[PDB]
Design a protein around this ligand. Sequence first.
Ligand SMILES: *O[C@H]1[C@@H](O)[C@H](n2cnc3c(N)ncnc32)O[C@@H]1COP(=O)(O)OP(=O)(O)OP(=O)(O)OC[C@H]1O[C@@H](n2c[n+](C)c3c(=O)[nH]c(N)nc32)[C@H](O)[C@@H]1O
Ligand SMILES: [Mg+2]
Lengths: 732, 737, 358, 103
Amino acid sequence: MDVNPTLLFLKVPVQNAISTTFPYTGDPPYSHGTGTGYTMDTVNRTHKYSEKGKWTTNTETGAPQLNPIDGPLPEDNEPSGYAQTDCVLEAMAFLEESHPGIFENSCLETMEIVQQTRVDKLTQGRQTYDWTLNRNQPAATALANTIEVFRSNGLTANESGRLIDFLKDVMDSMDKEEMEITTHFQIGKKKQRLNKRSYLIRALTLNTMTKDAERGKLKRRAIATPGMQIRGFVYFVEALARSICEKLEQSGLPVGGNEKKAKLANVVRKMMTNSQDTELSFTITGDNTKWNENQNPRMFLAMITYITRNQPEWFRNVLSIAPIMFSNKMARLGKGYMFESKSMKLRTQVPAEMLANIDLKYFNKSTREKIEKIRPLLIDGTASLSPGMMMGMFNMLSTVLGVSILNLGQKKYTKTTYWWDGLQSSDDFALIVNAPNHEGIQAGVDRFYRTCKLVGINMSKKKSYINRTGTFEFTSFFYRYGFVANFSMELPSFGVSGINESADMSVGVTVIKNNMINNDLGPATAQMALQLFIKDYRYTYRCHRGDTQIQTRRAFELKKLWEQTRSKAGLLVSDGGPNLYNIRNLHIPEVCLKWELMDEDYQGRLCNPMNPFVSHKEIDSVNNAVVMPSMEYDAVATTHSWIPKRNRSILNTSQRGILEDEQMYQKCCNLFEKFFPSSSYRRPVGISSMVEAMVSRARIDARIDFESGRIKKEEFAEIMKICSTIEELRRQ
Amino acid sequence: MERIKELRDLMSQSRTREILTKTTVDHMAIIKKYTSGRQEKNPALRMKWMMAMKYPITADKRIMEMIPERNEQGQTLWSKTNDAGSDRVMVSPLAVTWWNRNGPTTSTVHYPKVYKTYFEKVERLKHGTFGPVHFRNQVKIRRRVDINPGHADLSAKEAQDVIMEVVFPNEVGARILTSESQLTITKEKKKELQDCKIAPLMVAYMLERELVRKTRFLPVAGGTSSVYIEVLHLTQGTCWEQMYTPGGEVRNDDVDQSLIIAARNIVRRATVSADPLASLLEMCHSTQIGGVRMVDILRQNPTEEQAVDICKAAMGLRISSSFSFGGFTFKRTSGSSVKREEEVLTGNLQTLKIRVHEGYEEFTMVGRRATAILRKATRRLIQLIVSGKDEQSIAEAIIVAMVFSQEDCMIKAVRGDLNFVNRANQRLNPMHQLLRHFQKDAKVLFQNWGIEPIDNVMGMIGILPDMTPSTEMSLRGVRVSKMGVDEYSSTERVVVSIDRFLRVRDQRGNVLLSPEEVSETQGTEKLTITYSSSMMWEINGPESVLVNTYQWIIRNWENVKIQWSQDPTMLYNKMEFEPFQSLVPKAARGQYSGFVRVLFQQMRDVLGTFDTVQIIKLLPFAAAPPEQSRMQFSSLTVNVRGSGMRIVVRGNSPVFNYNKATKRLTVLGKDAGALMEDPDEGTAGVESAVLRGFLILGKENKRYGPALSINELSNLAKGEKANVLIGQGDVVLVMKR
Amino acid sequence: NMKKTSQLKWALGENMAPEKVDFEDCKDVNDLKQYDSDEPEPRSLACWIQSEFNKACELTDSSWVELDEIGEDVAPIEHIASMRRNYFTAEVSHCRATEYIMKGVYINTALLNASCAAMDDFQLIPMISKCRTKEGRRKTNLYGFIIKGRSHLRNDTDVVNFVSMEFSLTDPRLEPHKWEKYCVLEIGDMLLRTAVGQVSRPMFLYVRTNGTSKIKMKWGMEMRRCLLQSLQQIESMIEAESSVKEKDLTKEFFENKSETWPIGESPKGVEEGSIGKVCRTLLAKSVFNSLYASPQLEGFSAESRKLLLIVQALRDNLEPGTFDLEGLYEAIEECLINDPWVLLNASWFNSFLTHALR
Amino acid sequence: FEITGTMRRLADQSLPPNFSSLENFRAYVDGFEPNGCIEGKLSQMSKEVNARIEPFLRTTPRPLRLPDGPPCSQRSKFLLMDALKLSIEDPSHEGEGIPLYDA
RNA sequence: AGUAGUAACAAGAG
RNA sequence: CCUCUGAAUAAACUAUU
RNA sequence: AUCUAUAAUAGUUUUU
Ligand SMILES: *O[C@H]1[C@@H](O)[C@H](n2cnc3c(N)ncnc32)O[C@@H]1COP(=O)(O)OP(=O)(O)OP(=O)(O)OC[C@H]1O[C@@H](n2c[n+](C)c3c(=O)[nH]c(N)nc32)[C@H](O)[C@@H]1O
Ligand SMILES: [Mg+2]
């Protein structure tokens, strides 16, 4: 009897067992080598989707640019980027008509946000392409380097601390005839001068790479990272788009999780109720093919221009800068390639800056064709990519465009017996079409398809399907008369996080509890998950029970602690103790759970503030009250809240000196916390220099203490003298 | 002195001086995150890799002076190699477990105070009570609940301001605590934290854990209170419910809210009964709210609400003919009204329904800091007299009275981006939204309300849209006095008589309350409500009532089928259909009943046409006294969470859908069970339970001309066959009996 | 630490990476060219993968998992959960897939620890496992040996080579195509008792070179998650019924075995198993997903989910429609190249298509 | 917030084909009124650009096509069904003794 | 050789 | 021979703090 | 009755 698991679907509906279709217990696919091939393929495909457009040369950068806007209307079903400007404007106008005042209120809120936002908002994120180093750096590091260069080039509006002043600095730097930066080598400092066009090309460049660990894809794909100059404008544009999306029912963003599921269910049921009882209703689960390679920045500029009508000119300019910068963008090719010689048995790395004029005998047929097609677009080591949105950017503005097309489906606009509505989320969509008969359904689907074609949106025919209303799929949520649970999606979260012992224990128990609450994880399976997690935890941290004979380097200490302890149940699992968790007490921290079972000596040693595994404060001498470290998933800090080592790769590079710098920064920051205690709790805001603020605080504190009698006049005189000395040092 | 000396020392050096001089306070945040890079992308893999190393942990240099380099067996506990980018050294977990067993011992007596919330969770779990486990058909609903209760009358920003004031008095910037609650809480916490010896940052985090309120969207069943949401994983499951009561103290407001919800549900289900009073009494005696019998709460709880008053009158307790609105206690001295759903257009171009009360009425409003007498008609404020303490109290009372009057001027004064749906697209109460909108700023409301000259009677002062004491002209119908209080008589519980049909009457004989005056809103309870009876779903929400009604019909399909075939009169009178009949719109009930019953009769007159699904679908609708008519229904409505959801007579519907491939019934997405096939089912494609006086013969037949609508079937005669557009885009040939 | 002999140096890929030089210093080499980036060579499905899956779903006479203790039961729901967990553990601890889980977890843990601790050494790692016989006594089992190569692994995709030697009683000349990567020796004669008489059979040592990365080792160390993915599903099914019956049905399903689900096929037709058989089949499927993880499997699952949903809509009388169905078939088939697991899944999908639409 | 210099020229080079200045485009947008633009464009577009629905019946789907070639071979890291184990009745729990001693 | 799969590892650098 | 090192995309959401 | 406060960390979703 051959075992066929799939046959289980002959009795269990596919949705009710959808979790079986996710093979998320194996490792996900990874990319091994370079991403240059994928970047070249993306650029060539983006230009192919717009080949019938207008070719021009940019007078500021010299890069060829392709303009498909107002291009020929398609005669077939292949993807195309020939959006019609009048149609996009009409879609925006009708969206405004259906929801009066949406754009006005959105613009008011966005004006407040723009006027209030601080520059430190840019420090958020993981990486950022640093134009001063032609590679990726941490966002804070990139911002610091850019501010330093601007200050060296006489661009200091950012001192105001407002993001918009930083954008003014960027705009003013665009007009500089030259820029000067510093470079490191084998760890000296040298000066480099960039002419206007070189700096302009660097400012419009987005780095590219390959994405790793993505589920459900056979082939790899490319992703992009924006530069420092464009982040602020994109942030403001996305704030406006978020404000707009918050006011639309069809929008699937920016809501998520249970709230998103509730909103989608409410919207779908309202659509069902509005449907007449004597007309067919169908639902289309749809995908859009190459959404980001067919959307054009110029159409986003048009949409922003229409949205910001009757608004102050400065607001319109600051919003319009982003599409302007994105339609003149460049793409970094990547690492390059590697060549191998079998006879000589050697390997070498060929950088991507040489692809412009490298002989094509080394490459195979596919790569040779890629390079030949892309060579005309290569400038200064990058590729000219005018059309298309690169990767995962302007998601909410794309959502607005999709929702406008959905809004075009009302009977007041179709002017016939069929109509449609549905749900939009970036590029994914579900479409409910109502019509008296099947021919009406066909006509409505065709009209929706063609209207999407007009605005440069292509419905994926091979990934989209249609059935009767009642079941569909949207953004990986499977609706079968209501959304169904999918446990396999969250399954990778089970295990050991890798923060430390306390945090990992908390994360494991909390994950089990949350999956019980949300993903329909049963009681018995919850208990078995707890057992498996404790097993994995003990094996990872070498903290098996003290009454066992598992051979590990940590077993001797645990055995001694177990033998010297009277109350065993009070010991943590990290100390070789037993497991006291069950269903009823998954919501309680481990240390608090067994606090009333710990020996006094063990409890005091565990929660001893003077433990070198957690740092110490400096108020008075040392805050010897509680173990204090960023305490995520760690309610109570103990000796098990230690911190692991750091990666030491940079020690073999020229950037290792940067370590010193950051250390020194910390030093200074530490001192600032001795004058302003609230800085750690809440972020300080000011324009004065750190030294000036500290000296002023010292003077005012001395005066207040002397007036209130907390200090004697000798200390006051000494503090004033030292303040004067610091003032003298400030000038010298 | 140490701070200034260290600052001078740093300023002496060049790099430190440059950093301190060129860096503003704003850029201090940027440089604080400055780093060479945290090259970690797989923390779990990295942890597994590192734990195989000799010295994966980092520790301060002090460890070299506190822990020996080797233990008894010579195993190394730490090394002298520093961590890159810092001055900390590398150590082994053996060091941690050596400290835990041989380190110096301190006094950890204040930890329970620092982490009071978690030990409070432990105490609540310790003293909790466990009941039985019931297996049922759970219907979890996605709603916003609170996971951190925080303080009652505070928000996130207010709590943060209070924390800053208490812990960082000099860092509060320009904020001033204007709310009375904020000032009182600040004083109380300063008194409590007087002469504290804990670090300010940890005190701030403690106050954050104690005071800040946190809410999240979760799929919940039962109670939405914080104490009931912390153990949500234990008490509610996909198919089971565990009875559990937290062991702490219960807030009074939660008890009041739960009592109001329970009373409303009980009264609504009792109205549809043949003997409402006895049903209400037994339901009250069979209900618990958070582990406490409902009768005890009704005895010891002073709640002003219509349904609670009806329950108290049924139990013989003295009541108050008062309700709450906008923070004021309204009490109708005279007049009467009838509710009516009216569609209106908002000032900001929004269309919404409102429950307008018609008729003339007079009320007295009592507030914590204001009092008034109001006289109104249908969407018309006849007059208002306000005697508040200061300008703010009178303004608030005026706004509440204006919104209460349901004036068109008030509706047209709505401006800005005001929404009448939740962020999850769930309907909100229009009156509460209007109150919240106009309480922030009522300048436009006052400007558009109107002005009118006054007669200067009794010396009562005037008031202008600018909120000033005028004497010639004042706001239309509004007057300001000083001697109007009559507040003692508000708490004057009176003895009343309750009729069999739940009509509360005064000693004189005038009607005070009736079931029609109870709100139709279907809310959720803060504390879990437990019902003990044959039907534990008798006073549940609409979705649970629907699913359980159809599940009951399916489970008892054998005797139900026999009874339907033999003696239908007794079947329609089952007590199980009454909760379902409560959901059907009242004005429609009889009509629907009539319709359905006729179908069944035809289903018995014509043999060979016995569809189980049709009978199961339509049976709950035949439980009301029939009203004869000739109307044709293609669907029957049911009120679910304020929306009218339709059940289609023929074919599947969003609510009730039957699947033949699996032979399974789904009600609102919940599996009600699998029907069992009967040999008597008619396998001939003939339907005789769709139209009131017609028999569906087959699919489309082009012989008899084009199809016509359902409502145009009254022109046919006996024996005439015709094509009808009955169903979802389907045309079928039918004949008239 | 094994000595760096010539045989081990060859078998473990010692000094096999080409020397890394600058392009300027080698641009004039005649045969210098790009790395070979050809697509995988196609392979056809064989019968041995189905037999592997059939055996992996069978019951054993030894307990392979000894789950850890938890807190005491106080609430009635905890008692019900403990009873159901006893049923689940009894069903899942005596499965061959659980043995594979333990074997893989142990091997990957040992390989990772050796790789970190001994970067530049050839270590000898026995393949050990622990079980308990039906009578309840412990037993230690040896499967073979592994020899580790150098583990100077920088990226998460860097490969550490090793040599795997494993005992077996399977004659390698019955299905030679299955063992193209192995060099099978003969190392002894083993006496086995069939009924009452002893019989002598050859004992073979399958020897091969293999490799693994840190990501693969890490995901092999976490193979116990497979258990959850099965049990959860099973429990859901049970609960789905209790709701409509308003009573726990764990004992009814496990003991009475009244309700069955189609789980396989025979020459007669579709075969239905009990709840335990379904649980073991799902566990085996999860374990094989873990052992045979590849991009082809990911692509096939993602692409065939849509076709499953379309067939489901057809079976629900929801009048499904398509636009470019041939495009969907091409997308599905683009992922079937050479992986036995993905090919077997495709065959299973074809069988399901045959049985569902009849 | 003003757009001047390099930024103004980049803006002038970021418009639909028939516009040469940012201010001209803004003037066009401010006065825009929807007058049958979408309907006209739809009328112009050919009827080959359509989404024709093909019913999915029980006889529509076909079996998947598996690749041809030599049979696939074992690729697991260890033997699965062909494994043989040498066992000892050692009274020990999981991972207690020395692996080499047990071997 | 082997892992693997559209490009890499089979140690790199000083 | 010897020294060092084992590798951080965007948006939104979820959980904890 | 309403309910998008910030910042850190990890996980999930978003293919010609
Ligand atoms: O949490 C909900 C409810 O339980 C809670 N509540 C209600 N009563 C109390 C008390 N007494 N203490 C504490 N909490 C209480 O407040 C929430 C109310 O929710 P919801 O069900 O949405 O409100 P309701 O449906 O009751 O309508 P509401 O707008 O609040 O009106 C209250 C009351 O006033 C009556 N009413 C309004 N108007 C305009 C009236 C009128 O013109 N004439 C007459 N006779 N009555 C009028 C409402 O119908 C209700 O009776
Ligand atoms: Mg989709």
